[PDB]
Design a protein around this nucleic acid. Sequence first.
RNA 1: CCUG
RNA 2: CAGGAUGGCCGAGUGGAAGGCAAUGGACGUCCGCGUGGGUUCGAACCCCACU
Lengths: 827, 827
Amino acid sequence: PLVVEPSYPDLVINVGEVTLGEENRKKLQKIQRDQEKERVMRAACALLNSGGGVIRMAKKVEHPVEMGLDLEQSLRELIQSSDLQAFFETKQQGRCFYIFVKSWSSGPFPEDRSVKPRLCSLSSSLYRRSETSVRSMDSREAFCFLKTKRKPDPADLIFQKDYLEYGEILPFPESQLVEFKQFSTKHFQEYVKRTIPEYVPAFANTGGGYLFIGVDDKSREVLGCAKENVDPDSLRRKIEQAIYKLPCVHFCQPQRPITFTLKIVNVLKRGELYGYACMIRVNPFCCAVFSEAPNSWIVEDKYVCSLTTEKWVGMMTDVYSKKGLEHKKELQQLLFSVPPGYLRYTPESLWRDLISEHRGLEELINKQMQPFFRGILIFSRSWAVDLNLQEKPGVICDALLIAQNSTPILYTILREQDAEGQDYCTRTAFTLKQKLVNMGGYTGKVCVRAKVLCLSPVSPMDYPASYSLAGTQHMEALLQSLVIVLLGFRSLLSDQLGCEVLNLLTAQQYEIFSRSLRKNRELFVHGLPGSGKTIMAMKIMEKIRNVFHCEAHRILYVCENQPLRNFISDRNICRAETRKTFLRENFEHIQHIVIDEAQNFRTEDGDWYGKAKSITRRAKGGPGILWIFLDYFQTSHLDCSGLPPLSDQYPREELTRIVRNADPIAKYLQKEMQVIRSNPSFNIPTGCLEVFPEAEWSQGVQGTLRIKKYLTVEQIMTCVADTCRRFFDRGYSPKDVAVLVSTAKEVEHYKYELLKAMRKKRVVQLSDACDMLGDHIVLDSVRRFSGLERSIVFGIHPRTADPAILPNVLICLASRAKQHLYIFPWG
Amino acid sequence: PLVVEPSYPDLVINVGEVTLGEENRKKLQKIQRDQEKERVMRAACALLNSGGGVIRMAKKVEHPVEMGLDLEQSLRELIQSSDLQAFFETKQQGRCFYIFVKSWSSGPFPEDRSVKPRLCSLSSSLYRRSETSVRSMDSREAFCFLKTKRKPDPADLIFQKDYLEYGEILPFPESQLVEFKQFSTKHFQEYVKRTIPEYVPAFANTGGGYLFIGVDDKSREVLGCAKENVDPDSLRRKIEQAIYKLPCVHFCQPQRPITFTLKIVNVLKRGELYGYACMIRVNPFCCAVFSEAPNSWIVEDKYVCSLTTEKWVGMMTDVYSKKGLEHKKELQQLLFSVPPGYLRYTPESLWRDLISEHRGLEELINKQMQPFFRGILIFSRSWAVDLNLQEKPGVICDALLIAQNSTPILYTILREQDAEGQDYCTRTAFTLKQKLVNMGGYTGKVCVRAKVLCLSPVSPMDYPASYSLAGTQHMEALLQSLVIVLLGFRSLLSDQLGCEVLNLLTAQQYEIFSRSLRKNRELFVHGLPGSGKTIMAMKIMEKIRNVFHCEAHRILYVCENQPLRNFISDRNICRAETRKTFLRENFEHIQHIVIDEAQNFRTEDGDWYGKAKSITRRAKGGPGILWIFLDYFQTSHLDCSGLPPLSDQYPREELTRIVRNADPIAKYLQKEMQVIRSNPSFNIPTGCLEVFPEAEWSQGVQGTLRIKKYLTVEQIMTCVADTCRRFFDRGYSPKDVAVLVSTAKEVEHYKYELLKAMRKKRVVQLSDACDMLGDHIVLDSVRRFSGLERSIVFGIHPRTADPAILPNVLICLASRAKQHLYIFPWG
RNA sequence: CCUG
RNA sequence: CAGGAUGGCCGAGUGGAAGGCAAUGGACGUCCGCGUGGGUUCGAACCCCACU
Ligand SMILES: [Mg+2]
Ligand SMILES: [Mg+2]
Ligand SMILES: [Mg+2]
Ligand SMILES: [Mg+2]
Ligand SMILES: [Mn+2]
Ligand SMILES: [Mn+2]
Ligand SMILES: [Mn+2]
Ligand SMILES: [Zn+2]
Ligand SMILES: [Zn+2]
């Protein structure tokens, strides 16, 4: 059999001894020549269909040799192209001859889904009647044929006859619908058996036809076969069995079998019975009829396995991140920008942590990356776990080098030399390469080299020069495939890419949303939870200056919560003040006002709306911008907010796409918004919550949502500390984490209790929401954190004194978490 | 040569006598067999590339024959597929054998444009090196290769030797970069001339390489050419001439020749000169190198011609109506709706006109239409003129039948028998079929049968049954290609399709626009001339009815002009009053108010804006809609309109994309808009007119614009009458025509003067602008026609009391014409 | 196409 | 799973068109032609492939 070799960071199929060279292969017997060719072509087909690899064959001569014309032509028929160099590149060292096979197609959604087939085949076993001949459909022909079948005569005058006269000349030739066959007196009943699988599938697949057996092909004379050599009943049974044996694949309903008419009609000589003439009419078949199973091959597990008929048709006609595939270029330019002329180590925080923890790791890595002048070295605690493989103790870090003039190299740094270290690194490199092709959709020639390094004080395969990353184009394409691959797993870089995906979605929605600035002066923005409301407010405050040419101090931002106005104030895009400061102080020099979380405002101090109206309308440059952002799902009190009636809140814009939270968080927000709708507070006008999220919208970004209940306060603290330490080990910064409690009066208690547990995890710094720039965990109330967001949020015992306010707390908590949310309710 | 036969409604190529049948072709000599095959393939390639046709070949036998396996395989190679039935269907009657060729690629923008090449070819003359072999790229391979080229060793150690030793074994085999050739033993210079085009283009096309001539292919021995047999300098001259003789096509700059190094080295024997060995180092060429001109053919008018190298490369690397192509399905379902179970005659107005003018034409056509139980019979005064062919006097009408179970038939009805009639009908049918394929992009099997009919008292081809329109799908596809074709010519049906395209564009812009209803209660809509303002207002009132569930009479429409008020009232989608009526009467019953042409309003009768605000805001079901439509380019007076200041006119929606007028009218409107901006009025605030149309927006609808200046009044009226008579003869209804004058006071004078000429054109019924629905020509002033539209407009002597408004009156006129506009200014 |  | 096909007929030829019953395939010395179509080769009836 053919089996993939395990000691390689790639699919390596050893096809054994093969005779190479045209002259050497001409001296072979045809049987051995065809057997060796079929072995090598099985290997090539498997590697083409399985992400590419290397075919290893031991050659019977020491000196360099050509592959052989028959092998070359078989590869050409395999790829349906004379461009062999595109998919096959050969090397030879001593007795070993290598063919390096590129993947036929890459990714779950290739750019050629509707053009080229997913599979290469030695044969599709699909035959069509092509005029007077039967020809096999190649991969592309069969792809088009199945793509069509998947959409939702005088010969009959002869066929109707009950009998035929010996030597009768048929009045028609062989054509698209007719075939004549004559067989010897001896083998008639056996030659019919081999005739059926070739002409019945062809007629069935190409509009049907008539098969006359017993008609001289040249003179068209009816001859039949002598009565003594044929039993009509046995012949009919055999033909029926052979026809019904044919493997048919259905794309339709009903799935009735192959339909045909068979007649064994007497041939009379002078009126006496001379023999029997066999006539088959093959009515067109609804779908594809195969003469036998397709000769397509694939590597599954560690074997080279032949694809079944149904599995082949499925591959030929029919966690991946579609958003990642869409934004791969932007995401690559963001996270994996390839610099012009130096080797970049990323993530930089993780690299610093590694070199600090491990003595000599910096010197090791820098001495090892001497040969590389341009590229990126993507570090990780363990690329194995990043790719859903098993963690190996003793592995300090894994670094994926993507440098110029070099192949990708997966480095594994071991604190102590280990026997299984090279096996672990090879497994990780093989998984990475297979993912870069099959999931990342890399259509170029890729090989990830596994290379183990030891901090304490089988040869690699030499790939062609076309597997080296020549320059910017190849490095960027490989890195964009790596982006797509990473967005399919849970890891530090995957989460960073997900954050950038959320930022890109928010930018898209803001591009759609900012076109209202030219159209409105007053505008009440009704954003749903996680809809980007505050990001839109910031970007609109930037665009207001960009358009009206007014200096930043002329734009005012008003919010209810001090943490939010501090966060907005540190952006330097405007002046940011709280509701109370807004009412107290003078702002006659302000032209534009943006008011955010207006549903959280209060009337107890004054008419904030009236003040904003006066300031904006009395502006010198016409009526200034007065945009009031608000979310009624995130109300924080039962009193009237001073907003105008709902009927008065016009013109309106609605941010209904959730773009700030990962999919698990967004689904939870959508679920809880139904609970909010079920019983709105009395200060919430009933018709406001009738805003619904976009029905078919999804973020396509992985998140986390763990709800742990019936746990005590100390258990909550220890779980939070353990999760924080696990994140920080992987490389998440402390400024990605926030702990949100029910109310402020509990903030100090929970701060002390959480420090008590975090002193075991080596970070003893917590802060209120008023400081968001420091690299520290933020502990505060859910309400005080309104408007702000963090990647990882721990929601601790959501609570309020009045059930009329309670429902909104869970939304106001979940909407703060971008990717990871941990909720610890009462129980 | 091969010549297209002229007397058919198709490309019929007569390849003459051909031996058909496998046995008959086997009994031939190879030269004759190959010549007949070459003729048939040239005809088939020409027909594939020229829109399909028929190949006529006389066969030397009477009985039916198969085509022949070599001919079948050549067709398979021609179409790169065993699906011969898709493109070739053969018929034979008597001593004639027909091949019906379908177009390979059809339409200027095929749906497969990026996948399949535009051209079929016998040979691309493009060769590539495939390991140790040179392979000719088929059409698909050459397409991909040219697409790739369009986008923006030890062999060297042997090549560096200035001499070689006889029998020296070269240490390397043949490969992607190396070829070993021996010299011919008989004709050496001729052999080199022959070999150079085989290998130099392949190396140049793939990474270059070395060609060693004089090296044994099998043993790799260096043999060379005997000194007595070859002169090295003459051989060098022949080689360089042959290499520069190779056709090269460049997709770049600079367009350098083929770069190569040619060395003729001494092959010594025992240290003494024996012969010469030729080695060429072919460097990779930047673009495509051909061994000769591509073997691709096409039909040029009446001749079958081969495409040149550069012409072939152009066709292989790369009035057509893009909006027609986009909307073909909707336009077909609008105009050419295929009915179920009866035959439909269109256009009905033209059909009635024809049957009224001509005695017995109805009976004639009905008698001819008995066989057809379903389809559409598309009449015309002259399909020849509709397709830009010369008119033939004596043609009563042309009718294009498109019916089930029948091929397309172009009927030509002649008043009396005519010898030329069949020639005219056949030319028209051929032109129609060629347009349907090459311009309408019909990818099915199409034949238009030409039949001449006569009101008073060559044999046609019989096409395969696949050319008959099977049913709804085939007829719809053919009629959609017909829509695309018609939209590219000036004719009645083309203009009706253009009207529908304008309506579809307006509907799309309204789908964009109506999303503001959910977001705005009060809205000022600022439309540009011809932006659809009034159509949008009508549709928005229709949408208000549904979204607010209010009865139609609860919606009010207020406009300045009585004709527009009447036109809107005639649809019952609201209550429509004039500004004066609105101010005088009471409308507390109204909930929603839409105001149109608000810029023309006046204040002397009251405060309409305040009244509308009050009425809408005190609507019992909450505040209602108050949408004010206005266009400052169509300011009809210099007074105050009562609108709020431009700073106060918010929120604001802008309809910038002109969707109501054909392309010439739209461009004229844009130029007049720029002139208006250069001379703004004093009663229009500063920023009103800074609204600009979408820069690269086009309507894709053909129109007409004639500024017939320097004419007298009588000449103007006679020209108008002649144009109207021509349109009505062609089939346009009078209700498509409006005559617009400068002022209402001259309307009666111009009515008398226009009737003076129209009474000689067999129609006298003019109409006032207040009677739009009548089947009469509307003659009225430009100002009173504001808000109305008609397909053909005649603007006469545009003028105003104060010349300041003349640039505005010109726009107000040009925006009323949907497709055809005639302006008669002062001299 | 015919045949072992 | 394997074998054959040559000139008018019988038939010799597996890489530089016999013989037997003056010639006894063809196009324009070159080329095609040994069932047909291709390929390899300096060279094919001969070797390789597909088809019949
Ligand atoms: Mg013989
Ligand atoms: Mg022999
Ligand atoms: Mg020959
Ligand atoms: Mg042959
Ligand atoms: Mn057959
Ligand atoms: Mn047959
Ligand atoms: Mn060679
Ligand atoms: Zn089926
Ligand atoms: Zn070039």
